[PDB]
Design an enzyme around this catalytic site. Structure first.
Site, mmCIF file in Angstrom:
data_model
loop_
_atom_site.group_PDB
_atom_site.id
_atom_site.type_symbol
_atom_site.label_atom_id
_atom_site.label_comp_id
_atom_site.label_asym_id
_atom_site.label_seq_id
_atom_site.Cartn_x
_atom_site.Cartn_y
_atom_site.Cartn_z
ATOM 1 N N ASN B 8 3.530 19.135 66.102
ATOM 2 C CA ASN B 8 4.281 20.375 66.239
ATOM 3 C C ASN B 8 3.362 21.524 65.826
ATOM 4 O O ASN B 8 3.203 21.829 64.642
ATOM 5 C CB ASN B 8 5.539 20.323 65.362
ATOM 6 C CG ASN B 8 6.279 21.642 65.324
ATOM 7 O OD1 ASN B 8 6.140 22.472 66.229
ATOM 8 N ND2 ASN B 8 7.083 21.841 64.279
ATOM 9 N N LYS B 10 3.805 24.517 66.102
ATOM 10 C CA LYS B 10 4.582 25.657 65.642
ATOM 11 C C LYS B 10 4.021 26.898 66.325
ATOM 12 O O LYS B 10 3.537 26.817 67.454
ATOM 13 C CB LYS B 10 4.517 25.784 64.121
ATOM 14 C CG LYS B 10 5.015 24.538 63.423
ATOM 15 C CD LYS B 10 5.225 24.730 61.942
ATOM 16 C CE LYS B 10 5.716 23.430 61.325
ATOM 17 N NZ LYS B 10 5.988 23.548 59.873
ATOM 18 N N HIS B 94 14.814 21.991 64.196
ATOM 19 C CA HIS B 94 13.793 22.006 63.167
ATOM 20 C C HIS B 94 14.331 22.875 62.036
ATOM 21 O O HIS B 94 14.977 23.899 62.283
ATOM 22 C CB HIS B 94 12.497 22.580 63.719
ATOM 23 C CG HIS B 94 11.310 22.297 62.858
ATOM 24 N ND1 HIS B 94 10.941 23.107 61.806
ATOM 25 C CD2 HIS B 94 10.438 21.261 62.860
ATOM 26 C CE1 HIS B 94 9.894 22.581 61.197
ATOM 27 N NE2 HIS B 94 9.570 21.460 61.817
ATOM 28 N N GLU B 96 13.112 25.009 60.325
ATOM 29 C CA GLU B 96 12.695 26.402 60.417
ATOM 30 C C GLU B 96 13.685 27.205 61.256
ATOM 31 O O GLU B 96 13.979 28.364 60.954
ATOM 32 C CB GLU B 96 11.278 26.475 60.998
ATOM 33 C CG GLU B 96 10.207 26.163 59.949
ATOM 34 C CD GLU B 96 8.866 25.759 60.542
ATOM 35 O OE1 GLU B 96 8.606 26.062 61.726
ATOM 36 O OE2 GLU B 96 8.066 25.139 59.813
ATOM 37 N N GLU B 166 12.846 15.108 57.834
ATOM 38 C CA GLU B 166 11.857 15.961 57.199
ATOM 39 C C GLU B 166 12.378 16.659 55.956
ATOM 40 O O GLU B 166 13.101 17.650 56.051
ATOM 41 C CB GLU B 166 11.363 17.027 58.175
ATOM 42 C CG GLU B 166 10.709 16.496 59.430
ATOM 43 C CD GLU B 166 9.860 17.553 60.114
ATOM 44 O OE1 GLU B 166 10.412 18.605 60.503
ATOM 45 O OE2 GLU B 166 8.638 17.328 60.255
ATOM 46 N N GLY B 172 5.046 21.533 55.248
ATOM 47 C CA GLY B 172 3.934 22.441 55.024
ATOM 48 C C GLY B 172 3.621 22.790 53.584
ATOM 49 O O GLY B 172 2.853 23.718 53.324
ATOM 50 N N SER B 212 4.256 17.292 55.573
ATOM 51 C CA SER B 212 2.957 17.085 54.952
ATOM 52 C C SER B 212 2.282 15.779 55.329
ATOM 53 O O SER B 212 1.479 15.253 54.561
ATOM 54 C CB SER B 212 3.087 17.164 53.434
ATOM 55 O OG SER B 212 3.599 18.424 53.049
#
Lengths: 250, 250
Positions: B8, B10, B94, B96, B166, B172, B212
């Site tokens: 991904n 992003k 996701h 995010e 996740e 991240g 990560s």
């Protein structure tokens, strides 16, 4: 003030259709010095669209973008990516995103700053809802959105910014604001700009009207002193229609 | 269960870099019957990537999409547009998007269904916040997102879906969950899929770990019985790194 007519295809079309559109239109669009002709297509088509419009006056825009240059923002597109692709315009703060995708005045402002930082012309959308309109809060709402959106810009940049007044109740509803009312609101917006950045910036900044604009009524809006163009959704989907729109800017 | 490693990117890269990335990797990715290698790039690059990856085992995915086929959703990309482009995978829900762009379980579900009805393989993301984790609600939170996200599917299509657990706190941050723990959470998910779609579907559905994941720890996750792959962010941006991740799939 040079008129600017922008077509917002929103989430419509297929690559092939998008290319044909630019193909059938790119050559019959007015000269750049007379009218700014813009087509804001879905992210997926921008690449081929910029390719196809190369060497013509047809300008390609994005319907949105993020404010950061890059980062952990899955699904978002950066101004760097857009500039690099050859996109020149970007729609920011469209009510559709403000209503469904958490777009706020704060994020619109960040994006507007990001736009000027990356060489993209921003088409900033503002507009009151039916309720706000009926409560007579139109001017206050629009003033607040414009103020927050342009916060942090220099007068020189404001001159290049494009503000699109779009009463939310007029978007894709078939009910457009009258030219007089739209001119009044746009005049108010210009006045808000003049008080924030000076008369010079306000005299140069282009203010569009948006919301059910059709090739049979763009002229009525364009004729208004405070209205410099139109942000067009529905009626920008067909090539013939689009041509009539930009043609009115001459 | 065939392993699947999805990168991904992003909101990163430019068209040129993205193309070079595919070109450098497409021919050195493991055989498709062994591992599913996926690259989810920004909307802007999909077109060229699909063309470049055509005929290879490197599959191209999108980072998100809307649930409608078309409509007044300025800035959104529809599953129809993606399928048409040749995109096979799409990341949905996701964290995010969920925390920053009003992506809810309801909308994710709508997209999961849209994906299946449009011929796209969804990578459905789920995960708990640091808070929910510290409050022992991990299994509950994740089970809730997975149920709502899959609600409406048949056992046959659930088998083709991909769930990516996740821990939000692990995305991240450099702080990835432990293989054991991730195996527990993924194990729970698979159980939920079983209690809802039967064991036949629970044993076929692939569950990835995300957050990560690095070339130096991916094998520890793939080794787990409940983890069938990984959704990788930062470590998927470099071609060399991406190849190591997918190589671990063999």
């Amino acid at each position: 003030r040079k008129p600017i007519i922008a077509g917002n295809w929103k989430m419509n079309g297929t690559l092939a259709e998008a290319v044909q559109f630019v193909e059938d239109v790119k050559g019959h669009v007015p000269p750049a010095d007379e009218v700014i002709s813009v087509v804001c297509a879905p992210f997926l088509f921008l690449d081929r669209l910029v390719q196809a419009a190369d060497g013509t006056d047809l300008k390609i825009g994005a319907q949105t973008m993020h404010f950061a240059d890059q980062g952990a923002y899955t699904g978002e597109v950066s101004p760097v990516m857009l500039k690099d692709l050859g996109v020149t315009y970007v729609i920011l703060g469209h009510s559709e995103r403000r209503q469904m995708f958490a777009e706020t005045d704060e994020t619109v402002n960040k994006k507007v700053l990001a736009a000027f930082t990356r060489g993209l012309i921003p088409i900033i959308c503002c507009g009151e809802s039916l309720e706000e309109r009926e409560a007579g809060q139109t001017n206050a709402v629009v003033a607040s959105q414009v103020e927050k959106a342009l916060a942090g810009l220099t007068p020189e940049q404001v001159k290049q910014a494009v503000i699109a007044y779009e009463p939310i109740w007029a978007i894709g509803t078939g009910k457009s604001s009258t030219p007089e009312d739209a001119n009044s609101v746009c005049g108010h917006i210009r006045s808000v700009v003049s008080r924030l950045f000076g008369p010079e910036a306000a005299e140069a900044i282009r203010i569009q009207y948006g919301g059910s604009v059709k090739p049979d009524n763009i002229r009525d809006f364009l004729a208004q002193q405070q209205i410099d163009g139109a942000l067009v959704g529905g009626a920008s989907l067909e090539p013939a229609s689009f041509l009539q729109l930009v043609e009115a800017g001459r």
